[PDB]
Paper text:
[name] from the earthworm [name] is a pore-forming protein that specifically interacts with sphingomyelin (SM) and may confer innate immunity against parasites by attacking their membranes (Bruhn et al., 2006; Cooper et al., 2001). The structure reveals that [name] has two domains. The topology of the [name] structural fold establishes it as a member of the aerolysin family of pore-forming proteins (Szczesny et al., 2011), which appears thus to be conserved from bacteria to annelids. Here we report the crystal structure of [name] alone, and in complex with the sphingomyelin headgroup phosphocholine (POC), and with SM itself.
The crystal structure of [name] was first determined in space group P6522, with one molecule per asymmetric unit (a.u.), by multiple isomorphous replacement with anomalous scattering (MIRAS, one SeMet and one Hg derivative) and then in space group P1 with four molecules per a.u. by molecular replacement. In the crystal form with space group P6522 the protein was found in complex with a phosphocholine molecule ([name]:POC). This lipid headgroup binds specifically within the β-trefoil via a hydrogen bond network involving residues Tyr233, Ser227, Tyr282, and a salt bridge interaction with Lys185. Residue Gln229 is the gate regulating access to the POC binding pocket: in the apo forms of [name], Gln229 is in a closed conformation, blocking the entrance to the POC binding site, but has opened in the POC bound state. Lys185 aids in defining the gate, as it is in a different conformer in the apo form, preventing interaction with the phosphate moiety. Unlike other β sheeted POC-binding proteins, such as staphylococcal LukF, the POC pocket of [name] does not involve cation-π interactions between the electron-rich systems of the tyrosine aromatic rings (Olson et al., 1999), but it is similar to that found in actinoporins (Mancheño et al., 2003). We also find an additional POC-binding site, which indicates how [name] might be guided in its attack on the target membrane. We suggest that [name] interacts with the membrane initially by binding of POC in lipids such as SM through its β-trefoil, after attraction to the membrane surface through charge-charge affinity; it will then bind the full length of SM. The structures described in this study suggest that [name] interacts with POC—not necessarily only that of SM but also from phosphocholine lipids—via its lectin domain prior to pre-pore assembly and pore formation.
Residue numbers in the entry: 6 to 301
Write the structure that this text describes.
């Protein structure tokens, strides 16, 4: 995908009890059994998963990623074997069902292999099964190498990477126009409006590469709430807070809270001229898009 990348990473997997039936008497008893091989509470509208917990140095809680493939290696019965998963397999619920004939004086142990890719609980990645005598020894499976390959947005380097900021609900880009002889933010369909994100002691700064008044390039909130662009200063009014852990990445959905008006977030609002405002106790979702390449 245009702006994403694959990365290998270690994930946690374990063999659970699953189901256990004991037939201590005679004769052979039949039992129906149903299991659902699939990711727990999987969203049908998307494959992007918001991390509930970390996956090493690469993923942190709240980070967006997509599971490309998962490869867990196990040892049973005294022999090694490995099972791989496709993207379609990790995101599908297969309700496997059938009858198991338990022979007399024997236990049926259906083991349940799972995987927790940073919060994403893959219930029943695999089913081994094991019929064994009572009270005889049985082989317990053990995961030897659990690992996954995730898909993430290309990183945004602060003060370096040129991005486009797009309003998620309205699918329109933040653009710059003149208002009161100052540069001003307003929503538009143009892909020509590039920005650079910075970070210092006071917060994040949104610099425009499309100003008409030279030097007036950092986004800030007026007392009235309208978003204008000023010259670089120490003022909190031009400093912002992002609700997402670094590193920022392509396609990240974020909110921008003002550092001076601390409860006022950046959003769409029908102004008389422009429509990008800082409004109290409300904060709209914006997409960060890493720019492609211009032709020449
Ligand atoms: C994995 N399996 C249950 C389909 C075959 C292996 O049976 P067993 O290893 O418990 O004897
Ligand atoms: C007046 N307004 C609330 C619609 C936005 C204008 O902000 P401002 O340009 O007066 O600083
Ligand atoms: C937008 N509001 C009128 C609800 C309050 C926010 O004022 P402001 O923080 O944008 O200056
Ligand atoms: C006082 N100072 C000039 C060193 C910093 C002031 O930054 P500012 O918020 O007044 O623009
Ligand atoms: Na600094
Ligand atoms: Na300012
Ligand atoms: Na408007």
């Amino acid at each position: 995908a245009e702006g994403y990348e694959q990365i290998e990473v270690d994930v946690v997997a374990v063999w659970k009890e699953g189901y256990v039936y004991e037939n201590r008497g005679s004769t052979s008893v039949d039992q129906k059994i149903t299991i659902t091989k699939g990711m727990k509470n999987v969203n049908s509208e998307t494959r992007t998963v918001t991390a509930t917990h970390s996956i090493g140095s690469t993923i942190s809680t709240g980070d967006a990623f997509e599971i490309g493939s998962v490869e867990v290696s196990y040892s049973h019965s005294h022999e090694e074997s490995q099972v791989s998963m496709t993207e379609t397999e990790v995101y599908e619920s297969k309700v496997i069902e059938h009858t198991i004939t338990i022979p007399p004086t024997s236990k049926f142990t259906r083991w349940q292999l799972n995987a927790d890719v940073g919060g994403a609980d893959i219930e029943y990645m695999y089913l081994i099964d094991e019929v064994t005598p009572i009270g005889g020894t049985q082989s317990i499976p053990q995961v030897i190498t659990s690992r996954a390959k995730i898909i993430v947005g290309r990183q945004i380097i602060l003060g370096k990477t040129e991005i486009r900021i797009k309003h998620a609900e309205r699918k329109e880009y933040m653009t710059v126009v003149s208002r009161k002889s100052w540069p001003a933010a307003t929503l538009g369909h143009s892909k020509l409006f590039k920005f650079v994100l910075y970070e210092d002691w006071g917060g994040f700064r949104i610099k425009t590469l499309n100003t008409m008044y030279s030097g007036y390039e950092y986004a800030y909130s007026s007392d009235q709430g309208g978003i204008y662009f000023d010259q670089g200063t120490d003022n909190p009014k031009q400093r912002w807070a992002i609700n997402k852990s670094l590193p920022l990445r392509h396609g990240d959905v974020v909110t921008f809270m003002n550092k001076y008006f601390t409860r006022s977030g950046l959003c769409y609002d029908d102004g008389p001229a422009t429509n990008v405002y800082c409004l109290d106790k409300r904060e709209d979702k914006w997409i960060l898009e890493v720019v492609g390449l211009v032709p020449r």
